[PDB]
Symmetry: C4
Subunit: 390 residues, 4 copies
Amino acid sequence: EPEWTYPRLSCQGSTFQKALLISPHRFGEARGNSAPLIIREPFIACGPKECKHFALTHYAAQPGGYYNGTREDRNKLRHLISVKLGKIPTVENSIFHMAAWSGSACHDGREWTYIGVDGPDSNALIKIKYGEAYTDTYHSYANNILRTQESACNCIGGDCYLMITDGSASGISKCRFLKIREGRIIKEIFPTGRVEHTEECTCGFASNKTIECACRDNSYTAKRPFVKLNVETDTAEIRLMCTETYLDTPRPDDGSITGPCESNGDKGRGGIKGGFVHQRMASKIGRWYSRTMSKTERMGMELYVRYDGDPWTDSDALAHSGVMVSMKEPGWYSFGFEIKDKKCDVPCIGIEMVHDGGKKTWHSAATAIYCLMGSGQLLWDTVTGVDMAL
Amino acid sequence: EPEWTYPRLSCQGSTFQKALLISPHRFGEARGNSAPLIIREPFIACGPKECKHFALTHYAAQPGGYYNGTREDRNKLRHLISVKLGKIPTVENSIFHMAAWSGSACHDGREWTYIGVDGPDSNALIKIKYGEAYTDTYHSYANNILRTQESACNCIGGDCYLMITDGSASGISKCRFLKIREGRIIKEIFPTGRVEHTEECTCGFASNKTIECACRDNSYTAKRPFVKLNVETDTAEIRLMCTETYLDTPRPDDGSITGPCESNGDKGRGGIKGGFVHQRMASKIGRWYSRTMSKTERMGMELYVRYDGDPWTDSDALAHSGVMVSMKEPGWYSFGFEIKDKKCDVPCIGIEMVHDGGKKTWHSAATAIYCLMGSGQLLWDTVTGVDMAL
Amino acid sequence: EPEWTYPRLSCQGSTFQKALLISPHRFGEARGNSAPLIIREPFIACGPKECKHFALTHYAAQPGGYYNGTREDRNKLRHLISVKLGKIPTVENSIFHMAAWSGSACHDGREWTYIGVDGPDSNALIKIKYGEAYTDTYHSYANNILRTQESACNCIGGDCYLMITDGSASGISKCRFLKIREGRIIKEIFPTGRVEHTEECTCGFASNKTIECACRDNSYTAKRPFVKLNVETDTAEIRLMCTETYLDTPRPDDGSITGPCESNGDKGRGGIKGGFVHQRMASKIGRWYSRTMSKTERMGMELYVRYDGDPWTDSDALAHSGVMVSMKEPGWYSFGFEIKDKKCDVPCIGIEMVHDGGKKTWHSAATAIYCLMGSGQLLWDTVTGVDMAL
Amino acid sequence: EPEWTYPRLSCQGSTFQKALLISPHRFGEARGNSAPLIIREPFIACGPKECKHFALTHYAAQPGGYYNGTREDRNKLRHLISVKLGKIPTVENSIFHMAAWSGSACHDGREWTYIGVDGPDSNALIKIKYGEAYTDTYHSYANNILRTQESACNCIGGDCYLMITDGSASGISKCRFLKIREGRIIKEIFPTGRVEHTEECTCGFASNKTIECACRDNSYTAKRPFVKLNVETDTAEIRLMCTETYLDTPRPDDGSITGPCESNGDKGRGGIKGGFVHQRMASKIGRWYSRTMSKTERMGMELYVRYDGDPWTDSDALAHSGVMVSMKEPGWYSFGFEIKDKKCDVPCIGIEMVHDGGKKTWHSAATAIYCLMGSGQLLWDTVTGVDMAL
Ligand SMILES: CCCN(CCc1ccccc1)C(=O)[C@@H]1OC(C(=O)O)=C[C@H](N)[C@H]1NC(C)=O
Ligand SMILES: CCCN(CCc1ccccc1)C(=O)[C@@H]1OC(C(=O)O)=C[C@H](N)[C@H]1NC(C)=O
Ligand SMILES: CCCN(CCc1ccccc1)C(=O)[C@@H]1OC(C(=O)O)=C[C@H](N)[C@H]1NC(C)=O
Ligand SMILES: CCCN(CCc1ccccc1)C(=O)[C@@H]1OC(C(=O)O)=C[C@H](N)[C@H]1NC(C)=O
Ligand SMILES: *[C@@H]1O[C@H](CO)[C@@H](O)[C@H](O)[C@H]1NC(C)=O
Ligand SMILES: *[C@@H]1O[C@H](CO)[C@@H](O)[C@H](O)[C@H]1NC(C)=O
Ligand SMILES: *[C@@H]1O[C@H](CO)[C@@H](O)[C@H](O)[C@H]1NC(C)=O
Ligand SMILES: *[C@@H]1O[C@H](CO)[C@@H](O)[C@H](O)[C@H]1NC(C)=O
Ligand SMILES: [Ca+2]
Ligand SMILES: [Ca+2]
Ligand SMILES: [Ca+2]
Ligand SMILES: [Ca+2]
Ligand SMILES: [Ca+2]
Ligand SMILES: [Ca+2]
């Protein structure tokens, strides 16, 4: 049948470039004739021949009459939807996979695994679908909003890994990893180290032996929790990123958190899911990350890279690698993903660009894509082009 | 060629969970740009690779100008349509299979069989289509609205079985079963037993030897007629389910119908098609059923199960297994179906949630899907989210 | 590669039944959200796995602003379009094949041949496309509106046959047949017999050796010109249908044309393209035909059949086989076609049901389908359901 | 795998004929329900099985609220999009390939290569995508709007050749050719000859050894720069076409540029991209070209041909071969392309017909297609049918 998929060396390249903007609300004007779906938390995952652009819809279109409530996180109507990357996610072009107010998905070489969380806050549920068939669930172990990545899970040899957490977004959230094979949970991994508060991990393969993730601590630090997961022993350890280039929002100024790598620092409450993707070379490993340009609001988005070293011990500043979204434009969640070329994998970061006018209007987002492409430096930024009054 | 489909053991699991809501009219606002089809009597049937969501449209969309007449059951415009499950059934997303005001469909491992009934009330006609070709018909035997399941037929080794009936909805309607192979009726099956009124059977496989069905009696009882059909002898027998948990609507209080299992009891006139699906295990069979929360109106929907026993003689209560639709929301027809996972079958029940504002406005429905998924207990209910005024 | 296609014996059956209605303007209301294409001259042709529903669009949608001019026959904007049968022919669901104000198409087993005529009236052009590639043309031989079938051409062993004509619709139109193989004209057949005025032939296989067509004489008779074409010698002869059941509109009363079979009779000026399809049995040949119910206007449509005999010598009345469209509904062009079942061919007649409100509004049509299905008699008629004011 | 595509001998034929009009804005009325994309610079490229219709959208639809800015050439929103040729390029029918305000694309027998340029004017960037993956980039060499063909690139044995240029549109712009294999630049080709200004080359294969291109000089002449590129040595040479039939717009009267073949002549500033395609025969080569009917404005389009000779030294007039667009209708860019029939290639020219109502309204285009088809002479012209006020 199809071979199972594995991480491969990345395609040659040394800079990212602007690739593609999916801005559905460019066609949502009241005088227009389209039906872009109102969504948030977009992410992309690719199989061998195609990528799918996922998001959590509020099950409402622009223009329409169900804008009230579209700025809330969880309810009984939100669903995980997708379109093939490059198609506009409208009512008709999308597929509704399952009810979900938190999601993930990934292809293993043979088939797609879709993950969607719903249920009441005190007792929510991870539901897993493999292709068409609902195949498994996982229960709330801390009875406070069981939730997951909002980005691609990661499969190697048929084993797909997924970060989940449950418990307080303001206190302790001890996260866990699930190992899922053909839609069924075959192992639960309890991490070690700094496990007190890890949210919305963005994960990817550092090699065939290691998954790494850069996550969000919503209460104590603007340094990102960083996961190293050994795929062969099914063990994970988490410690803060030591770089003075703190990747969360809010954050203090770079280099301002004194003391050892584990020091929490100021402006730690609050957070944002951040992009991270690997460039695997025969010789070395590139780790690419994104963060907003404002230190306090979800505005702008800049790319950074560092080759090798240990993210847990290295306080060195990451190398600035281009403005993907200026300060004038929204820069909300970002995520890594990889496109499969014939012989190598292309690392990319996607950027959620939320159209926020508060609760008295519709709330949704565009998705911008940057990928490793040629040499030199990143050349152009992305704007959504949407006027929320139309 | 591909080979013929057979029932397999069900996938492991012990509770149903909310899976998917297809709520087309969330996009039918006058100020929106979508064209959801006005439908009723939805059902789902799946082949090895995909499930189709079928319904009987009134050949009208919302917003639109043909709302008058969409509350009627039968006319020259109704058609059997489908979309791939997960797509919104809109004017352009749907395929129109055949003219029909009663329908069924099922896949035999190789091709789809579509069933549509139309024709004058006194001389209506079952029409069968195999793939793209119209292959056979069956004539009215009692000249009083020949009609069929409104849920999936059931194929084993190329033979597809279908319930049909003809007769007064407030008098005698003696059903029959058709055995259909590659779109052609190869055998008529005349049931034995309590045969005076059987409607809208929801049928599935209890094993490779037995199809069972939970049906509606619209005239005499609130207990469901229960068919056991032996596929090897092509014989069927019907008796009333003896459980005190009467699955019809209207119904009297549970356990209030005194006397032997076959006693009709009180609040017998009227009815609703009911969900039923099997959970086949190596040595145990789970029978899952749904019924409205109101005893008299089509409001809410609750799940019930019983393992083993004989439905014809067990008076014990069915075990309540979750509120799928609250008393506040519409609960009209329900039906069972199975999704084909790689090595096993996933039992599910779908729920038609009709938007009824009377004869004065459009009339149509959302479809809610619940499936056997994991263990523990059912966690959340389904709302359509539709404001019929928009 | 794919085998070339041949006519096969028809599937068992002895009556037609209502199969499917494609009524796109059921969704064309000004307050709705759809874009049905404004069309006329629909026809259907099938390959081994799918049928396509063709028509000549005016390149305009309802609702829209280009209604003026949609009641004219030829212009620089009309195009041959199609959708898979069962899909609604809207702006987006359709494929535009080529510029054309007269058309035909057919599948040969391996690929589709599309035929579209355009150009100025005095010097028009048959253009032939095989799949994606424009492959050949044929010139106007009489410089008066070169034109073709408005129904499926017919392929056997890779050879596809097509009737064309050129010359006066009120005087002499000597028609011709083209033999097209892989999109290229490989023979021109000059018919013999009554060749003075043959229009819009509806053709099909009587056997592997003979194509037959029932055509329209627009100036001299209400009897249909009937073509017998020997596929092996590539010769054709044409003579009038002798049946007293005159199939054209206008027409006099049945049996009223006195004298031999060739006698022209009264009310011969004017005409309509008529449905005709074969039921090939091992033993005998069924010839099915349709005609309007009004003897003078394009209202209603009735089915007729006769087995065996020679259409050129037999004055016997055809057997009335059901009202497909009542007198209250439009009955304009009709055409035969065949759907391919696994082992046999299903004969069908399609009916163009024009929405005509004159030139001050839009002009388009619905398509109704009837096919051979089971035994007994035809049970129900078709209405478009469209109110042209909406 | 499939194998690499090579030029083949053209299909038999001696005249072009009107083939297809894709006029999206026939459905863009304010009272309509469609969403045609606002585009410019359309072109078509075909693989073995299908042709794609590409254009540069302004990421806006008609009707809509983003018309301001749609007359500009370059901005952060323009994207390269396509549909299968024959589909209307609407918001939902199109795929968005990459951010781009100059584009090209072509199929090599195995996969599609997409080319998109964006970035700041002084430092723009060629981006290449092979299938779904971004594979390589090329940087600005003259820091003045690096840009490319706006028509199909050309592949032979897996090597795809592309013209690019960079420099002042009213001064020096020395083009270059990129040799691209599986999405990666494997060679730069620096032309020899009259190299001071070459833009928007329309290129194709004269044989297995030679690509030829008819280009635009926007600064010095109304004669088209003509590239002969030797694919075996990967060398190119450019000289002005010597024909008195000057193919650019503006242009002086035919034959009025006196002196030797390389003389620039009068009315040289300004220009338009021009159609050119080859008709390869066993011993003769036809070179087909198009130019506007007006000498000074983008109004009308006429076809011309010349067999054999050397474009660089023949001053003889090109033979006029039909009016494709009358003086009354828009004739803006034209381009050549070839459709792959079963054993031979069909040469065609497409014509962008821009709807220009100035900066005050939307700005976009229809695409007209003419192809070598049969013999005799070209018979009809193309109108867009669009009233820009609706
Ligand atoms: C911190 C990341 C996840 N949390 C915290 C959930 C939580 C709240 C209170 C107590 C416990 C848990 C968020 O809120 C996420 O934030 C955001 C956000 O933009 O900050 C978007 C997500 N839609 C939301 N996720 C869920 C599942 O609601
Ligand atoms: C009882 C279930 C089937 N019947 C009885 C039909 C009948 C009426 C009167 C005399 C004889 C027969 C219904 O009315 C069904 O009810 C309902 C319903 O919601 O109860 C929906 C179906 N659209 C309708 N089916 C048909 C075929 O009309
Ligand atoms: C008689 C059938 C074909 N003709 C005659 C064409 C003609 C007119 C005058 C002189 C010569 C030829 C028709 O008009 C057809 O009639 C009709 C019709 O509904 O009667 C529809 C067709 N759109 C039209 N065909 C063309 C190609 O215009
Ligand atoms: C001359 C053809 C390319 N140029 C020159 C670009 C340029 C301007 C000024 C200085 C340097 C370069 C054009 O302006 C093209 O013109 C036209 C046009 O209609 O003439 C359409 C193209 N959208 C545009 N291309 C770009 C890439 O902007
Ligand atoms: C990972 O392992 C697979 C399977 O053995 C191999 O094909 C692939 O190229 C490896 N990836 C690396 C070395 O990054
Ligand atoms: C039914 O029989 C088939 C073989 O005909 C077998 O493959 C399948 O697993 C059986 N299923 C059950 C439920 O017994
Ligand atoms: C026609 O000929 C083909 C090929 O020989 C055959 O397969 C087919 O069944 C024949 N059709 C008839 C007998 O009608
Ligand atoms: C070009 O060469 C290929 C083989 O490489 C051949 O198949 C093809 O017909 C040739 N075409 C021309 C136009 O010479
Ligand atoms: Ca934080
Ligand atoms: Ca829509
Ligand atoms: Ca009852
Ligand atoms: Ca006549
Ligand atoms: Ca549309
Ligand atoms: Ca010039």
